[PDB]
Symmetry: D2
Subunit: 116 residues, 4 copies
């Protein structure tokens, strides 16, 4: 898949399941257009967000709904969300994995970018 999101829970030592993720793409007029969305699976993964045709060059924002996740668990966290913003596909199509590792007051994120 050209875009995959993986989310882990640093408190539980587990995938972060049922995490809402919203992806936006910056439009010609500088606003953030809704691009795709979904929820992580029981493995903490979200596949199927887009296609190689649809996933054209642009500036994309992957918003990971960490507060909704921590509060669905009955916990009060620090951040509203974790946002990951990046230019994609500007040297041709690539495959992107965005990983996030979550704690109530902290997160870390990395990208793995591969050329098919």
């Amino acid at each position: 898949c050209p875009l995959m999101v993986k989310v882990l829970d640093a408190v539980r030592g587990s995938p972060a399941i049922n995490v809402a993720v919203h992806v936006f793409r910056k439009a010609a007029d500088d606003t953030w257009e809704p691009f795709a969305s979904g929820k992580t699976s029981e493995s903490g993964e979200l596949h199927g967000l887009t296609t190689e045709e649809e996933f054209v060059e642009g500036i994309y924002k992957v918003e990971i709904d960490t507060k909704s996740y921590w509060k669905a668990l009955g916990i009060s966290p620090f951040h509203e969300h974790a946002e990951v913003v990046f230019t994609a596909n500007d040297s041709g199509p690539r495959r992107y994995t965005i990983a996030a590792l979550l704690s109530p007051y902290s997160y870390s994120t990395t990208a793995v970018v591969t050329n098919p």
Copy 2:
């Protein structure tokens, strides 16, 4: 009441002269400029706000990571790093937002103390 600290995981150093913009969420859900500055030689940015001005609300701290890496001659992944949070009066009074930067990754934490 608000401090930002930025570190460089490639060089093992403070991240110096990084632009940081702070925004407050307005009633209409847009982000309005609140505070900004450049990190110091110690990677810190102090003096952003005062207790009087830093009322409860949703704040966004945008760290211009892309320019930092480019100035070092390194191509990075992210446009910027964003830290978005609610300031809450029933919590401790001083907020430190720390970020640890790599070209394709970052870590951020909050230290909230009294």
Copy 3:
């Protein structure tokens, strides 16, 4: 596999390939006995370290040879290695993934623990 190690490179945005990993287990006499070893694949993964029979309860140390990795790449890093030390299987068999995300002066590690 009951024990898997995944290593990522935060500088490259890629799996960390050809990373040596040594696993030790603490003996009755408090020394660190060699348990297993291997190298990460082109996906940054190392499988096949042990079997459920062999992977008994104990205190295990997963040593990730980060300095050898960064210097094989011609780079001078801060740490000698990254060590991950944990009690395993003390409530019965579990499956462990140890993940590490590497930079020259920093690393982060997490565990995912699942019950088969």
Copy 4:
């Protein structure tokens, strides 16, 4: 010349009263005790060594993370967090080892300055 800073990613606070042991690698490859202490109210441990004693070599900083979490009534994954590194005179002079703790994860960085 050596400082250790420990933060808690669950509570958003310094990690207070954490035991830290520093070791120096001996000629025979064993680890010999060098310095130890407990983090302060600010999560910091200063006063470990002096410039005179902190010669080039391989050092290990062991942070007793398991006891910290247990005292909070949380079951953690790791026995401890280990940070192993070479002190090198041709590098800057002051080393700060920072660690950010969660029950099943930790992050560590080095800030080496002059």
